């Protein structure tokens with residue numbers, strides 16, 4: 388069977404999986420811990436990267452280049468931009484951009500550097516698998532664009548600008564970087580986020596209130612996807 | 617030992633490929649990685665493409681896939697310290713990500729849990745650079761570099777980042793590369809030659825001086841390879 392990596396950013400996003408698995412082997416590498424487990428006869432490597440683009444890029448690269456993961460599922464929470472999203476709602480990214488990658492001084496569009504794309508796509512077959520799981524389990528699942536950058540967004544004006552430029556439905560600090568790594572290394576990637584907040588005024592309070600539960604929702608979903616891989 | 621030499625742009629690495637003359641290349645991770653022998657060292661070289669994610673990926677690939685045991689970063693930067701002139705060399709003692717921001721939760725700018733604000737480079741490589749600078753009569757300054765995913769060309773932003781971090785220069789790849797190297801237990805050296813002063817019209821100075829400043833930095837890191 389295919390070797391699966393499951394990646395989140397924070398302990399809250401991955402600990403629910405570790406608790407469900409119960410039995411696993413911990414390996415210290417890249418100033419972090421990587422967890423190795425067998426789930427319903429699937430070989431898994433799991434980790435939380437620590438927050439942000441650099442940490443999540445490094446973890447995705449380690450999971451693939453060092454440990455040989457063949458498919459990568461990202462699980463965690465996000466800030467909702469689309470007004471139809473509520474706290475706890477699941478969104479998978481069809482494509483992702485880095486909103487804070489800015490060499491626009493040279494005439495490039497926001498989010499662009501030479502040699503790369505503005506938007507990185509996720510894997511079609513994995514996205515269709517997620518739609519099958521959502522139907523099976525009667526779980527509401529939305530498709531959308533995720534905007535990634537190294538700021539916790541809690542500002543209606545910033546939210547509005549990023550939504551306008553990229554038609555983004557949510558924001559977070561790891562998806563586009565993870566997707567870029569997977570695309571570069573020819574590994575199918577799936578990015579799932581459960582909303583923890585609405586990325587506006589007082590979003591830090593909502594994040595703290597809802598991160599634990601929203602993280603569990605996304606974590607459970609990706610574990611169910613593993614069963615179809 | 618196996619040595620990685622990494623830049624962000626073609627201009628930062630092509631001067632080394634011209635000097636080395638003979639090299640092989642492998643296509644991997646949506647990039648090209650170059651391989652050559654130099655003074656009893658296998659070198660692996662690349663330009664990452666611009667910014668934090670691209671440079672993180674290349675550093676990780678060079679170490680995890682191609683087995684680099686030391687990494688030298690070479691390229692250009694925007695000067696913040698008023699004593700720096702275009703063309704001057706600066707090596708980083710430590711670096712921060714000025715645009716890594718979870719300050720809503722009370723943390724300082726540049727901090728996320730599990731990491732520190734500043735990431736250090738390797739003391740022994742830095743001391744080797746001082747020896748090379750002494751030997752070659754090259755002026756070399758030590759300082760703090762602030763890294764982020766924006767080209768800085770605004771006097772107010774320059775001043776803010778300089779004040780918060782006491783940064784001597786800015787760029788878009790150093791802190792990320794240094795973090796990867798530190799995490800993977802690989803000694804890292806970050807060298808930059810100034811291409812601009814990161815204020816008004818910095819985009820025009822950058823275009824004018826990138827080629828020459830890139831050559832200055834490149835030459836220096838190759839001289840370091842002789843003493844390793």
Ligand SMILES: CSC[C@H]1CN(Cc2c[nH]c3c(N)ncnc23)C[C@@H]1O
Nearest residue numbers: 396438464465466539540559560586
């Ligand atoms: C403690 S920093 C937030 C952590 C959880 N992440 C996802 C996220 C939820 N709400 C967000 C928002 N308003 N702005 C940016 N990111 C997010 C990213 C980071 O790992």
Ligand SMILES: CSC[C@H]1CN(Cc2c[nH]c3c(N)ncnc23)C[C@@H]1O
Nearest residue numbers: 624666692693694767768787788814
């Ligand atoms: C075409 S984008 C600029 C490329 C060269 N870089 C170093 C650099 C020089 N001057 C800088 C400045 N004012 N602001 C940020 N970065 C730099 C980073 C990027 O690879």
